[PDB]
């Protein structure tokens, strides 16, 4: 603080061995990738002062988060897909299933919400939740369009239902793979 | 951020900025721990405050902040829009299927 | 106990008639939402540990039973049009099959953790 | 960098009438404005420092009114010996001065 | 181990106030159980209504148990409120099982289904009243 480079000077004693005990350290959800030791001088308005920096690198563990969050969202998508098999007659059943799936996804999103601080940017997990919501919402809109069209033509409704049944899992797989590859 | 002297009135102790008042409060380039805010700038003023014990000098500094709306857009606005759209979806449902609309 | 009783609840759908499709669907989804919220409540009291733990195992497996029951019911509804007789066959055999699985799994889990 | 505009560029009246001078800052200067009067063949003399504080050895006739950007100098009951220029300057940043105001009669 | 010392002791005698626990825990339990028996009075034909009554009541009781258990510190043994919640849970579960049995016996023996429905209607309120009376009289007077 009070002594400049004309008065004092710092250095790590036994450079490599100066800091010890990092290897034995464990964190509940982090892994110490490595650490570095710097030695520089910082210039303030009152002079130049010696400085030392001990910096770690911490990598998060995805198993916790995978299990806690990624599974339930994909599973709600699974239920939204199961909704298609149900015959067009049971409008109430399919509608209730889909809306309840939406609400469950919102519940898991909310449970995520309390943990992290407010931040302007969108995190990766937020991106995945948004994508899953787009999938579910498009499925429900597709069913609404099917119901509207059916009275004009029932065969069109059946064929379009089969078409969506076959493709939505494919598009979900594609988006999931591209997202994972982008963020890994 | 206002500061002055405790117990020394203007007749005894007076404060002043070291350099030009515009350059007397410096913010480090790498130091900003704001999450949902932006620091546009700062301004300094010097005045006088009256109190029972006497009349004192006050140095004033204002830090101008603007809130970031990115978090709230995803958090509330989009969910509200989507809920409104889902509520609309009810119109296109067939009149027969009362339970679905309920 | 709450997880065991939720798994117990998921059964009752089977006895109910296949015709009441909305009832079975609503019950299944409500039970799934319950299992999710209960899993969430359970975890918080624990520190965030990467490695799986015993309490994670029980919650996960009970959740799997619930999901399996609902999925099998949906597949049953689809297959009824294809083969109603096979549908009733599967309802009865599910009724008699799953309970043995759940109980033997419970016993294996408990005895294994007692042994260690 | 900061522009100070003085208005009016010139104005006059008879002895005793209230006279007001106005100086406006392009940007924010928080009461760091000053007023000087420069008699003919003389150096400037400080009249008002800070927004309103009256410099020692100055008659109570002069008074200054402050703001963030809009400042004024009022000479209540102008006498017949106040016939000099009047410069507004800001010190919030590197000092700048206004074009000055000429007072006659 | 370092000698004999004089120890001065004082005891402050406290008694808990129950009103908050009444309003937050017991009253909702009573209401949910009452709803569970209200389920019986519906027509057997309206299967979905009875199904949703049963499921929602069981779920409300589960959530009230997890909510009530968090107030007091974690402890191995069981509290009186825990027994009350457990018994109300048992009543809700038995009501749902009764509905399932009635459904099964429907379309095979309408008379037997109606008889068991009436019998359960008369029995459940009676049993709940007996249990509630005994529990309250037991704990209040001591
Ligand atoms: C964590 O962040 C810090 C800060 O950004 C990283 O420290 C940086 O480390 C590099 C490599 O040691 C430094 O580069 C060096 O710069 C000097 C300047 O003369 C040069 O002579 C060397 O050849 C080398 O290139 C860099 O200056 C330093 N950053 C600062 C601000 O000092 C650190 O590497 C990051 N990671 C970890 C695991 O700590
Ligand atoms: C509209 C669905 C929804 C609901 C609900 O059930 O309203 C019907 N509730 C909470 C929600 N939080 C969300 C966050 C999202 O991503 C930024 C999102 O995707 C755009 C959707 C929701 C969302
Ligand atoms: C309708 C009863 C109920 C239920 C339920 O689902 O029962 C059908 N669930 C949660 C509840 N919290 C309550 C808090 C109260 O007091 C402020 C209260 O006062 C009468 C009732 C409840 C209550």
Query: Cβ contact (<8 Å) for B36 and A120?
Result: yes
Nearest protein Cα to ligand 2, atom 16: A130
Q: Give the residues across from A56 on adjacent strands.
A: A35
**Residue-wise DSSP of E60-127:** HHHHHHHHHHTTSPP-SS--HHHHHHHHHHHHHHHHHHHHHHHHHHTTT-HHHHHHHHHHHHHHHHHH
Q: Give the residues across from B50 on adjacent strands.
A: B55
Ligand 2 neighbours (beta carbon < 6 A): A 102-103, 106, 109, 130, 133; B 74, 78-79, 82-83, 86
Extract the tokens encoding A82. Answer: 């199961």
Residue E25 has a CB neighbour count (10 Å cut-off) of: 18
CA-based nearest residue in chain D for residue B42:
D28
Strand arrangement of the beta sheet that strand B37-50 belongs to: B2-4, B55-67, B37-50
Nearest protein Cα to ligand 3, atom 13: E28
Ligand 1 neighbours (beta carbon < 6 A): A 34, 36, 38, 40, 55, 57
Q: Give the residues across from B42 on adjacent strands.
A: B63
Q: Alpha carbon of C89 to those of C10, C69, C76, C96, E61: distances in Å?
A: 19, 15, 10, 11, 34
Quick one: chain D helix, strand, coil %, rounded to 5?
Answer: 0, 45, 55
Sign of the dihedral defined by the CA atoms of residues B25, B31, B36, B40, in that order = positive
CA separation for the pair A47, A3 (Å, rounded)? 9
**Residue E68: burial class (beta carbons within 10 Å; 0-12, 13-18, 19+):** buried
Domain D4-103 in CATH 2.60.40.10:
yes
Query: Cβ contact (<8 Å) for C37 and A93?
Result: no
Q: Alpha carbon of B20 to those of B16, D29, D93: distances in Å?
A: 10, 12, 6
Nearest protein Cα to ligand 2, atom 23: B79
Q: Atom of ligand 3 at shortest distance to CA of E35?
A: 8
Query: Cβ contact (<8 Å) for A100 and C37?
Result: no
Q: What is the resolution of this structure in A?
A: 2.9
Q: Which domain holds residue A109?
A: 62-184
Domain count, chain C: 1
Contacts of B93 (CB under 8 A, 6+ apart): A91, A95, A144, A147, B100, B101
Tell me the CATH architecture of domain E18-142.
Up-down Bundle (1.20)
Query: Cβ contact (<8 Å) for C77 and A85?
Result: yes
CA separation for the pair E31, E89 (Å, rounded)? 12
Contacts of D16 (CB under 8 A, 6+ apart): D77, D78, D79
CA separation for the pair C65, C102 (Å, rounded)? 8
Which residues from A are below 8 Å from B89, CB to CB? 140-141, 144
Residue B64 has a CB neighbour count (10 Å cut-off) of: 10
CA separation for the pair A160, B29 (Å, rounded)? 58
Of C9, C26, C41, the CB nearest to E58: C9
CA separation for the pair A181, A88 (Å, rounded)? 37
What would the 3-class secondary structure string for chain C be? CHHHHHHHHHHHHHHCCCCCHHHHHHHHHHHHHHHHHHHHHHHHCCCCCCCCCHHHHHHHHHHHHHHHHHHHHHHHHHHHHHCHHHHHHHHHHHHHHHHHHHHHHHHHHHHHHHHC
H or E stretch at E15 = none
Length of chain D counted residue by residue: 105
A23 is in an annotated binding site: no
DSSP category for residue D64: E
Phi-psi group of B5: left, alpha or beta (phi > 0 → left; psi -120 to 50 → alpha; rest → beta)? beta
CA separation for the pair C11, C98 (Å, rounded)? 9
CA separation for the pair D22, D33 (Å, rounded)? 12
Minimal Cα–Cα distance from C83 to chain E, Å? 22
- Measured at the CA of B72, the angle between CA B71 and CA B73, to 5 degrees, comes to 95
Sign of the dihedral defined by the CA atoms of residues A145, A150, A153, A155, in that order = positive
Relative to beta strand D70-75, strand D85-90 is: unpaired
């Amino acid at each position: 603080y009070g002594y400049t480079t004309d008065d004092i000077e710092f250095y790590w004693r036994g450079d490599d061995n100066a800091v010890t005990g990092v290897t034995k350290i464990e964190l509940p959800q982090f892994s110490i990738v490595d650490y570095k030791l710097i030695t520089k001088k910082v210039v303030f308005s009152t002079g130049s002062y010696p400085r030392l920096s001990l910096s770690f690198k911490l990598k998060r563990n995805i198993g916790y988060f995978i299990l806690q969050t990624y599974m339930p969202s994909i599973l709600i998508t699974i239920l939204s897909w199961v909704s298609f098999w149900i015959n067009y007659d049971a409008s109430a059943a399919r509608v209730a299933l889909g809306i309840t799936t939406v609400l469950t996804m919102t519940t898991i999103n909310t449970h995520l919400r309390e943990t992290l601080p407010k931040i302007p940017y969108v995190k990766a997990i937020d991106m995945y939740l948004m994508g899953c919501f787009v999938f579910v919402f498009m499925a429900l809109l597709e069913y609404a369009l099917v119901n509207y069209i059916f009275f004009s033509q029932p065969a069109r409704a059946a064929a379009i239902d089969r078409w969506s049944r076959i493709f939505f899992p494919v598009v979900f797989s594609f988006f999931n793979i591209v997202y994972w590859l982008y963020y890994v | 951020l206002k500061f002055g002297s405790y117990a020394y009135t203007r007749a005894e102790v007076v404060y002043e900025w070291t350099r030009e008042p515009a350059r007397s409060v410096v913010v480090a380039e790498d130091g900003s721990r704001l999450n949902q805010y932006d620091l546009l700038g700062q301004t300094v003023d010097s005045g006088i405050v009256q109190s029972s014990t006497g009349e004192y000098v006050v140095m004033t500094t204002h830090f101008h902040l603007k809130r970031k709306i990115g978090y709230f857009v995803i958090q509330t606005y989009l969910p509200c829009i989507m809920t409104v759209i889902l509520s609309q979806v009810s119109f296109w449902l067939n009149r027969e299927s009362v339970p679905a609309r309920t | 106990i709450p997880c065991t009783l939720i798994v117990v609840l998921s059964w009752v759908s089977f006895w109910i008639n296949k015709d009441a499709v909305p009832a079975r669907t609503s019950l299944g989804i409500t039970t799934v939402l319950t299992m999710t919220t209960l899993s969430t409540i359970a975890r918080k009291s624990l520190p965030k540990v990467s490695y799986v733990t015993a309490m994670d195992l029980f919650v996960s497996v009970c959740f799997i039973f619930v999901f399996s029951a609902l999925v099998e019911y949906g597949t049953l509804h689809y297959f009824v049009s294809s083969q109603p007789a096979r549908a009733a066959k599967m309802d009865s055999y599910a009724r008699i099959f799953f309970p043995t699985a759940f109980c033997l799994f419970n016993l294996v889990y408990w005895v294994s953790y007692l042994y260690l | 960098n900061i522009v100070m505009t003085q208005s009016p560029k010139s104005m006059s009246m008879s002895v005793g009438e209230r006279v007001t001078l106005s100086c406006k800052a392009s940007e924010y200067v928080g009461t760091y404005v000053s007023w000087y009067q420069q008699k003919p063949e003389q150096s400037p003399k400080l009249l008002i420092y800070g927004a309103s504080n009256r410099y020692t050895g100055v008659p109570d006739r002069f008074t200054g009114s402050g703001s963030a950007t809009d400042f004024t100098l009022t000479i209540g009951s102008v006498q017949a010996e106040d016939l000099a220029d009047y410069h507004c300057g800001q010190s919030y940043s590197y000092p700048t001065f206004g074009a000055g105001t000429k007072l006659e009669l | 181990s370092t000698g004999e010392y004089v120890v001065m002791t004082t005891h402050f005698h406290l008694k808990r106030k129950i009103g908050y626990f009444v309003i937050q825990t017991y009253l909702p339990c009573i209401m949910t159980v009452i709803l569970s028996q209200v389920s019986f009075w519906l027509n057997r034909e309206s299967v979905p209504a009875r199904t949703v009554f049963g499921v929602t009541t069981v779920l409300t009781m589960t959530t009230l148990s997890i909510s009530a258990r968090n107030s007091l510190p974690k402890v191995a043994y069981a509290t009186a409120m825990d027994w009350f919640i457990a018994v109300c849970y048992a009543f809700v579960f038995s009501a749902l099982i009764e509905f399932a049995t009635v459904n099964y016996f429907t379309k095979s023996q309408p008379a037997r289904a109606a008889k068991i429905d009436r019998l359960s209607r008369i029995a459940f309120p009676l049993l709940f009243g007996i249990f509630n009376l005994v529990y309250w009289a037991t704990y209040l007077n001591r």
